[PDB]
Every structure is written in structure tokens, then in C-alpha cells.
């Protein structure tokens, strides 16, 4: 509906992802026909940027109240599941960090803080 993007640095919404058109007598390419959340993945994967992350939790270091593990979220809450520092010792315990309170994991003891982006 507006100016078309070339890289994901110029994408301020769904209004920048329509694209140019194909020509008469040609099987069209995906860079000439894609609109929604499909073209956003396409413009991510031709550079090396993974838009939808699939990397699990940090299971290296514990959590002190002075130095807590920072969990990043775009909301005021995010559900965090702890299962240990050697990554399978602690059982599955779920926690909800909030911007006003830190979770502390009643069995092993790691502290989680929320980073609001």
C-alpha cells in the first residue's frame, strides 16, 4: 500500500511489504508476489536473520539476586520453565517473572528478571 522494502531495516509494519509485480508470460518468483508474514521470513532468510527464534533458555549459570538471569519480553510477563543448571537436574518448574517482582524457583533457587524491550 506504500513504499516497498528491500532489507529488514526498512520494515515498519505490514504497509511496507507488498512488492513489485510479475510480467505477462512468466511464472512469478516469491520476491515478486508475497505480502504478509510470509515475505518477512523471506527477507529474513536471504540475509541470515532468523525472525522466529527457536533457541532454549540459558542453562549455564545460576541466579543470584544481585546478578539475575535477564529474560527478554515485549510484555510485562513471560512464562519461564526451569529444569536446572546442568540442564536436566531440577524437574520442570514454571515461573512468571514480572516488571515488579522476580521469580526464584523454590527447588534450586535461580532468580529471573524481566527485560522489557
Amino acid at each position: 500500500q506504500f513504499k516497498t522494502a528491500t532489507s529488514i531495516a526498512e520494515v515498519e509494519g505490514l504497509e511496507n511489504l507488498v512488492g513489485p509485480g510479475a510480467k505477462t508470460g512468466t511464472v512469478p518468483t516469491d520476491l515478486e508476489q508475497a505480502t504478509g508474514l510470509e515475505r518477512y521470513e523471506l527477507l529474513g532468510k536471504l540475509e541470515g536473520i532468523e525472525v522466529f527464534d527457536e533457541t532454549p533458555l540459558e542453562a549455564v549459570r545460576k541466579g543470584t539476586m544481585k546478578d539475575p538471569i535477564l529474560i527478554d519480553s515485549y510484555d510485562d510477563y513471560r512464562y519461564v520453565g526451569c529444569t536446572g543448571v546442568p540442564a536436566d537436574s531440577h524437574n520442570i518448574e514454571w515461573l512468571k517473572p514480572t516488571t515488579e517482582k522476580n521469580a526464584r524457583c523454590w527447588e534450586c533457587g535461580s532468580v529471573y528478571k524481566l527485560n522489557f524491550l
Binding site: 539476586m65 526464584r104 523454590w106 527447588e107 533457587g109
Partner: protein, 100 residues
């Protein structure tokens, strides 16, 4: 797989590094959740840990859990004739002497 002399060192090391009341009660809660009763040395560390964080009710509730973990009555009184200079220096009173 864990033996008595490794349990009674690992829980001493864990009790000598707690910084808040949540952590002291956390290590105290999973110490009384095994088949091994705690040693008299571990309980002597737990009362100093409760002294650093300045709590009184937890130092009483440790001695109340020993009455439930220990099988008989003679072993409970054998625990209380060795944890006596710890009690009369810090000042901890048992539940049956307070009558709360």
C-alpha cells in the same frame, strides 16, 4: 548413589553460603527429604545460618522436625544432649518449653 559422608559435606557447603531467608528455608526443606537423617554437624551449621539471617521461628522449627524424622524417643534425646552448647549460647528455646 550418594553416601553419608558426601551428603554431610554437600549440605554443609550449601548451608554456609545462603544469603536470605528464602535460601535458608529452601536448603532446610530439601535436607529433610531424603532417607538419611541430617548429621549433628549439619544442624549445627543450620542454626548459625539462621543466626546470620536473624530469624527465630526457623531455629525453633528445626528441632520440631527432628522429632518427626527420628524413629524413636531415645535417639531424639541423644540428639538433644549434643546440641546443647549450641542452644544455650545462641538462646534457642524448644517448643515444649515455650508452650505456644
Amino acid at each position: 548413589e550418594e553416601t553419608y559422608e558426601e551428603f554431610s559435606q554437600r549440605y554443609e557447603k550449601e548451608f554456609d553460603e545462603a544469603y536470605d531467608l528464602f535460601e535458608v528455608q529452601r536448603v532446610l526443606n530439601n535436607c529433610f527429604s531424603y532417607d538419611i537423617v541430617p548429621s549433628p554437624a549439619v544442624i549445627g551449621k543450620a542454626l548459625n545460618a539462621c543466626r546470620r539471617v536473624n530469624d527465630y521461628a526457623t531455629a525453633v522449627r528445626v528441632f520440631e522436625g527432628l522429632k518427626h524424622k527420628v524413629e524413636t524417643k531415645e535417639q531424639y534425646d541423644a540428639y538433644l544432649e549434643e546440641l546443647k552448647d549450641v542452644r544455650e549460647e545462641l538462646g534457642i528455646d524448644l517448643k515444649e518449653e515455650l508452650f505456644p
